Design a protein around this ligand. Structure first.
Ligand SMILES: Nc1nc2c(ncn2[C@@H]2O[C@H](COP(=O)(O)OP(=O)(O)OP(=O)(O)O)[C@@H](O)[C@H]2O)c(=O)[nH]1
Length: 664
DNA sequence: TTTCC
């Protein structure tokens, strides 16, 4: 089954992905690199006092606060869903190798027993229904841009001036490009408007993966993360091998002299795809209006913020099932892409825009550097984009693509297993829409809250309920997959968008509460995804602009965990053991410094406020803006705070652009 | 200078 074309950096096909400037050339050549991160200023992730601290802390908590999770996967008691060994990683040092992106997932999906299209007319109706509800009656907004992000292929600029320039130009030429594409003239489209080429595969860290402590061994054991080699990825898993990356940290002593305590490992690595910006611009301009619609009209199932926000919806349920999906992104079906593109055409969207959109979801990928002596290889032909990688991380609508898939999938699961008496209501398109419209507002007997694959599925009182409980039982035994479309299962330790649902002895939603995930406080504070980048002097451009600020939001975020107090205390104690410092002091110090330095970037303060008008959301986002693109959205952040991190584009120009794109 | 709501 179609092997994918592969090209080497040397090849003209690859050469043309990188413009004649130094940054772009350097991107194409970039080699496997690694090294201890600067966890906080002047502190390395492998500093022996720090590692000693992680050894003591991690053990102490695992010991005194073992997970309270039932059978079932509801958490109770202490609010701990797992051990605390997650912090035992040499942050900045990757597992070897990273995976190669699969060029085609059709086999992956076939072997997994997953449908290659809607299976029943009902589902086909519901998927198109979801397209219609989401992409209709949209309100124009200005295209926002992360400060310091890359335009990737082919210029690799972080100059806002140049980004705005590119974006604006892209909205003008979007139409010619799509039409060109409609004519099969992809190369022309890429050469004239930089729309096409490929994704740039950047490997990012997941600093905290599973590590258990073997009862029989006494040795810690790292979770095995499976990865593909070149052959696997090009052949969709026909040839080649799929195997376990090595997290073994011993190489760290031999190579770099670094001292490696027992039970510490190299970090997991997630592949990440950077989009050609000229192509993503036209897409983001529409994606954001769509996000806006769903978080307004279908706020029930889609718009989540405060822990009380979630609790209010769920407490009304008789049953709450916490699902989750395995490797959602690599599994995501291209048939969905096509269907989405189809109904969008039927709604009367611009054919040339649906074509841009379509293409963005079948684009080749530039594989950079999964390992030493590896990478620098283009997968797929940009002349005729035909890759089926699943969902490309930096596509511009990837949250929405995920949401579309999983929201319907989930509803379907509910129907199939719990609410047959509901099918008579989904006869045609209009009836389907009205049903979906109702379902999403939370007006039916089956309910759902979700962001992409993370969901909690809900049953009120009624006929579905009994079915609900069986579904839940089906999910526990785990012998049979409840969906035709994706591999679904119950979360072992139920939690939604970061907050744990804390059940009491009743084990019912009614007497359940949302508290923060204490383990997340730890991951965030001692195992950050990036270093502090103290070389970057413009902090709005740093991955972690104002680390110290999280101290001020700690109480609001995590103060509701049953063991909050005890955890801060254990830290203090272990930190004193390891540093002869008050950890608390060191934070309050850093809180102060970053608070001053902030007034600089928010002239709209600007010192004298003091931490002022800032909500907890702001404070966590300032310390970690990576929370814009998974947890919170625009209108959850104060407007003068947004403009520190983001930058807009001529509203006239988006407004003009949108108009030529949409039906009405 | 490293992509993603
Ligand atoms: N919000 C948020 N999510 C994270 C963070 N780190 C990891 N994740 C999420 O954790 C999820 C783990 O997904 P998987 O790749 O399937 O790992 P897994 O849940 O163990 O999957 P299985 O191997 O099937 O058990 C990812 O999809 C991420 O979205 C983080 O720092 N913040």
């Amino acid at each position: 089954p179609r092997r994918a074309p592969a090209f080497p950096l040397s090849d003209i096909k690859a050469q043309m992905l990188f413009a004649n400037n130094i940054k772009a050339q350097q991107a194409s050549k970039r080699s496997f690199k690694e090294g201890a991160i600067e966890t906080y200023e002047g502190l390395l992730s492998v500093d022996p006092r720090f590692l000693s601290f992680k050894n003591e802390l991690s053990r102490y908590l695992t010991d005194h606060f073992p997970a309270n999770v039932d059978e079932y996967g509801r958490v109770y008691g202490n609010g701990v869903r797992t051990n605390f060994f997650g912090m035992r990683h040499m942050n900045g040092f990757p597992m070897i190798p990273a995976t190669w992106p699969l060029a085609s997932n059709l086999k992956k999906r076939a072997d997994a027993d997953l449908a290659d299209g809607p299976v029943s007319e009902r589902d086909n109706l519901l998927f198109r229904a979801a397209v219609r509800l989401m992409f209709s009656d949209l309100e124009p907004v200005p295209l926002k841009i992360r400060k310091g992000s890359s335009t990737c292929i082919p210029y690799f600029s972080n100059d806002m001036g140049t980004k705005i320039e590119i974006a604006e130009r892209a909205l003008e030429k979007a139409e010619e490009a799509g039409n060109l594409m409609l004519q099969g003239k992809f190369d022309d489209a890429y050469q004239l408007h930089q729309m096409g080429g490929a994704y740039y595969v950047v490997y990012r860290a997941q600093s905290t993966d599973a590590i258990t402590l073997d009862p029989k061994t006494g040795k810690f054991v790292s979770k095995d993360r499976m990865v593909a080699d070149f052959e696997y990825a090009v052949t969709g898993g026909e040839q080649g091998s799929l195997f376990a990356a090595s997290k073994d940290a011993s190489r760290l002593k031999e190579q770099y002299g670094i001292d490696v305590p027992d039970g510490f490992f190299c970090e997991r690595r997630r592949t990440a795809m950077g989009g050609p910006f000229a192509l993503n611009a036209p897409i983001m301009a529409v994606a954001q209006p769509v996000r806006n619609k769903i978080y307004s009209k279908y706020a029930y199932t889609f718009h989540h913020t405060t822990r009380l926000n979630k609790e209010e919806k769920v407490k009304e349920w008789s049953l709450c099932v916490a699902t989750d999906v395995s490797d959602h992104d690599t599994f995501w079906p291209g048939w969905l892409r096509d269907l989405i593109c189809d109904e969008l055409l039927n709604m009367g969207y611009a054919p040339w825009w649906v074509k841009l959109f379509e293409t963005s979801l079948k684009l080749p990928v530039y594989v950079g550097a999964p390992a030493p002596e590896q990478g620098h290889t283009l997968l797929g032909d940009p002349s005729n984009p035909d890759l089926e990688v699943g969902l490309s991380s930096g596509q511009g609508a990837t949250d929405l693509m995920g949401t579309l898939l999983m929201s319907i999938t989930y509803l379907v699961m509910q129907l199939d297993h719990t609410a047959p008496h509901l099918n008579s209501r989904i006869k045609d398109m209009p009836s389907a829409c009205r049903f979906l419209d109702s379902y999403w507002q939370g007006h039916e007997e089956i309910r759902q809250i979700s962001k992409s694959d993370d969901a909690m599925l809900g049953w009120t009182k009624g006929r579905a309920l009994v079915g609900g409980h069986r579904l839940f039982e089906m999910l526990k035994e785990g012998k049979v997959n409840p969906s035709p479309y994706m591999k679904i299962s119950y979360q072992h330790g139920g939690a939604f968008l970061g907050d744990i649902l804390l059940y009491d002895s009743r084990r019912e939603p009614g007497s359940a509460i949302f508290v923060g995930n204490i383990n997340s406080m730890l991951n965030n504070q001692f195992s950050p995804e990036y270093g502090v980048q103290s070389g970057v002097r413009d902090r709005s451009k740093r991955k972690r602009p104002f680390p110290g600020l999280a101290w001020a939001s700690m109480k609001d975020t995590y103060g509701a965990c049953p063991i909050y107090s005890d955890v801060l205390e254990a830290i203090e104690r272990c930190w004193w053991n390891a540093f002869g410092e008050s950890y608390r002091a060191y934070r309050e110090d850093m809180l102060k410094r970053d608070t001053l330095e902030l007034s600089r970037y928010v002239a709209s303060m600007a010192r004298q406020a003091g931490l002022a008008e800032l909500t907890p959301i702001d404070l966590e986002v300032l310390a970690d803006p990576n929370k814009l693109q998974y947890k919170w959205t625009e209108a959850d952040v104060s407007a003068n705070i947004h403009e520190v991190l983001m930058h807009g584009v001529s509203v006239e120009k988006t407004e003009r652009f949108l108009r030529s794109v949409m039906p009405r």
